[model samples]
Target: SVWFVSLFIGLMLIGLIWLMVFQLLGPWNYAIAFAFMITGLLLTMRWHLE
Candidate 1:
């Protein structure tokens, strides 16, 4: 279940950041959202190496 837990946390964290875009008229939240995706993916490596 290592991979499974990582996937769930990734989605949950990703969901939080994307929601912030709603506060503005336009969006460059794409940058932060994209970064988070990479960050989350990198974090998965920790679980994988275990």
Candidate 2:
């Protein structure tokens, strides 16, 4: 319903796609997941800071 709520939901979706749907494994997990999570965090910070 809110911005941060959607953020967590988005992260959950990514986790599922990365681990479940994509069936990906190995270092790609950190590679994609790191950027994936950081982007969300940075955006959230930017929103509040602004």
Candidate 3:
């Protein structure tokens, strides 16, 4: 759904920014950030296609 995609992208963006601003670069943090960013990118593409 569009709402879910928007919400998910918002969360991923906010979370990524928060982690970076706070310098929370732990291993898990990196993993999560990467996953979130990639997921966000993929979802954006999906949204564009639809």
TM-scores, all candidates, are 0.46, 0.41, 0.46
lDDT of 2: 0.64
The per-residue C-alpha lDDT of model 2 at residue 20 equals: 48
Task: Give one digit per residue, the lDDT tens place, for model 1 in 1-50.
Answer: 76677777777767767586565323566776777787677775765442
- After TM-score superposition, what is the CA distance of residue 40 in candidate 2 from its true location, in Å? 1.6
Name the best candidate (by lDDT): 3
RMSD value for candidate 3: 3.5
Instruction: In model 1, state the lDDT of residue 47.
Output: 56
TM-score of 1: 0.46
Superposition TM-score, candidate 2 onto the true structure = 0.41
Put down candidate 3 lDDT per residue, 1-50, tens digits, no spaces: 87586667768677776867686546777777677667667665765542
Each candidate: how many clashes?
Answer: 0, 0, 0
Model 1 stretches with alpha carbons more than 4 Å out: 24-39, 43-50
Candidates in order have lDDT scores of: 0.68, 0.64, 0.69
Per residue, candidate 2 scores C-alpha lDDT tens digits across 1-50 of 56667677667758665674456465765666666666677556645532
Best-first order by lDDT: 3, 1, 2
